[model samples]
Target chain A: PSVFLFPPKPKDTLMISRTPEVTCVVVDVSHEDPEVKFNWYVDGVEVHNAKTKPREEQYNYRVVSVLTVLHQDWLNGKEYKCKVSNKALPAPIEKTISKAKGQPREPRVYTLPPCRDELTKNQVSLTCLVKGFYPSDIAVEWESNGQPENNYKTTPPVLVSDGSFTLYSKLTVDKSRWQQGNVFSCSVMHEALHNHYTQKSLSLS
Target chain B: GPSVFLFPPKPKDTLMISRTPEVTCVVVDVSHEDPEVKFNWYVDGVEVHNAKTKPREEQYNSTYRVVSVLTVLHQDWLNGKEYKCKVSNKALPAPIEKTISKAKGQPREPQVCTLPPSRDELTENQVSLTCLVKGFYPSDIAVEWESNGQPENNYKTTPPVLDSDGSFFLYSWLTVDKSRWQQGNVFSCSVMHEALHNHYTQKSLSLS
Candidate 1:
């Protein structure tokens, strides 16, 4: 089975994920307006069974929902569409996702030390480049001193001209800690990696 | 910087056709960068200081195509020394590079075919033998015409044309008298390619 990732656009964000048995399409819409509606369509036919999950007022009331279907029933190339409408907006904000496309290429990870110019007295940023991969269904994680580290931001999978995907994941750390000798690592997990992860690490002197 | 071949050795004179072969590396579509944009050339991992870069040619949009050339001795290039070109600017954290070396690719044997002359040539009492050389790699090739009679200079060969699969093709035409062609004289097209290991392939033709 193949995988794909189409990161969100401006509004009416839609994305797809899959497992061994089921496929899920999650629609994320900003909650500026009330009673936002989500309509799901499969193969151009309207359907029900999309549920809106709880919204977080702390997150500006962003409304999230998902449409789930069994992989045994859904064909590989089928398209799924979601139309979102709010009372203030006239036309619905719509987006779609299809299951399959180009063949997959395994990623090569290059973990670069902080860009010299991007470093300052207070903060140092490390860039982990995950490039030349396909299907874009990959995840990046960081570890500092063997503990799970979190101050990193990863860009959306960038589609390069070679029909493959590349992503840049950056980790920010306190310069003093980086100077005091901390070990940082970046790990990439992808289906093309044959279920194994590729990792590169940096050790400060 | 795709393929490397020996251009005839040149003498030390500017603007003269008799100069060392120039190996140039091209960097395309770099955003209109600062005047500090630089190119560095290296041979076999050693820096070559005699490299020269032409002015950044302005492209259609806000970009520039930079070409830097390194003139090297025919002895060094023919000896299979690696040539590297590095392009750098303030915007880049590191230099980007392209490298070339002789005999760096697999030898792909060429397919050769010969076709007879067209009706116009026959009507003009002159025959043009066409030899099509296709599916060769490394691009550098030599095509010549030979026959039972004295070798003549009425031969026209096209430069190697790159193909979609990264291979190349070329056409060599040999023009001769139609009466001589019909009298059972053999006309042969000789092709010499680096990939052929000094052994050339011949395609001969005759009307009778």
Candidate 2:
């Protein structure tokens, strides 16, 4: 009879801050036998770059035979999977973090001294700063009072020696001029990133 | 000779005042499933002790462990005064249970203030003193120094900055009169925040 066991699920699905420094994955592997070997993989690749000896930095892979799959050095917003199998079993069990790639998340930033609940002069300013990309591939745009407005300049997209690029651009509006509310939009179209990744305009008083 | 009956400066955020013997009072409010209750102990703004306190299985908080008894094991190094205990929790955000908590109708007592400890004397050379107080919110803060029972020179500081946790800190300084501590010199820091409101609850810091 074939038997398959999966790693125990971690209490939390993802760790954002201080990512990669500390990662905890719990694997649940308790089947009808003990001969089953525990194996872990990432993106279909086994992480056993080098075999670890007793008390070594690398994992021995043979000593531990339990349900909890505790692994550290996890990159922030990286998809990972854990699998356990026995000769009797045909496939390995797996799990992964489901956030969209590249858009790794941190707690949403909430600025203090919140803008007046009621727009004072019917005008307000909104700013968004995007980081860690390269070469002006992203296009920045603005929508004033529901109409597209070309009031933006994409700072020379940061070009790293390694062909990667990051870009930052902002748009401003005189709130009083907006007969209707204004929506500021930001778009990124770098050579290294997908052409369709766009941050829709955000609206405010 | 004017006496310096300075209340032990309430510790500011993160910088905690030591609570001796680490008070461990478990308040179990068991009205829901997996309450995840916590009993936190703070001496002076610092988190000194916390216990994953749960209600006596199937028992309510009012019935068991209603009040915890604590005895300070050692008070020698307790900053020249007997340390006191106050219990709080995430379950109960404020209104701490301390032995010396203020009574309901007492004209709000002067807030607990902390002054820089001779830093100006040793390093700055200029006689600058900054006064800080805790437990005020959305309020004003001021520091005044007196000589010979007369208000010498006093300055108002920017409003106290209260942190995510409900404690406040503010500083005011002066660059005059460094040679000596005047016989009647008095330094006072006052805040005009929520604690000063008629409806606001003010608690005086004292050894309970």
Candidate 3:
């Protein structure tokens, strides 16, 4: 007699938009127990022609059952399951194939001036508003005279009626920076941008 | 201004990026399809189809469902432009307007870069953490600082700024207390934007 632990192996979930794919597999028992039995089911319907195949001993006796299916079945919301029953286990081992879930979307970035007066005066407050984005993760920063400026504030991202997110970053600066100004800018980095970055700039009036 | 009665007063502006060759802006149900009502469309503030008197109209539910469609090259919308629709009826004193922008496509997400302060800057009991976020769209983003996975409330960030190409750029700074500066803690900048699909980008730095 032998003692063993049997857990079914499943493949990575896949996404397909076409037809005729290798759906899933079902197996019987080891090559030593050639008489073991099992079944292949797709959306609760039984299929035929799944035979047990044996491989040369890589270490142990390994047997495999191959199943092929049409892409239209899965795309049309069909389910696939493999069930194996053998004397070596307490109960049947089952594995099912499922669809993968989609990932989150990225965000858009921009800046908005709060008022006209601040646009030209010696000291001004500018607002950077990032809108129409998803996934609450974001980074906003300010710079002046080509150095990292410390005086600024950022609001948490907010949800809008259109199923998007919006946020505010404000930077306060001296009018003299504009009078003899070099450059003032804000930079945004997020998952949406991937390998790129976005920056908006303002100048003295 | 005289009170104007405009039917379907709200114009639903939509942009189709894949639909090249032609793009359309539609305004429908003006003044219940009244014969006296008139419609106008504008592109970048310039009037179009001004000479065409019979734009398009339909009758339904005992009233008229007038419609106005403006078509342009798909490149027009992709160039970062604006469109406006105006409707006027004799019953109203002023023409009502419904404006829409063409930034209807998904935006490219931002990429964050982090830089550490120099030795001289760190000696003054202050060290600056700069996080640069660039190349995003629609201009709405939120920035935050975190230490070892917890939010760091003491920090400053610039407002979302604009780029020449209609995208956006932003930066944030975090000042670490001198005592905690060398504690080998992890600090990160987190970005929140709509295009991220409820996911965020986190760029982190560690001090030894």
Task: Quote the lDDT for A186 in model 2.
Answer: 54
Task: Write down the TM-score of every candidate.
Answer: 0.37, 0.21, 0.31
Tens-digit lDDT track for model 1 on B21-132?
7777776656643534577778899988887777877777457666677887655754678888777766666767777766566658776766666433467665566676
TM-score of 2: 0.21
Best by TM-score: 1
Off by over 4 Å in 2: A1-38, A42-79, A82-96, A99-124, A127-185, A188-194, A199-205, B1-208
Ten-residue segment with the worst summed lDDT in candidate 3 chain B? B6-15
DockQ of candidate 3 relative to the true structure: 0.01
Worst-scoring 10-residue span by lDDT in model 1 chain A: A7-16
Error of 2 at B21 (Å): 27
RMSD of each: 23.4, 22.7, 23.4
| Candidate 1 segments whose C-alpha is farther than 4 A from its true place | A1-205, B1-20, B28-33, B57-64, B73-80, B108-126, B132-137, B146-171, B175-177, B183-188, B195-208
Candidate 3 lDDT at B54 equals 43
Docking tier of model 2: it is incorrect
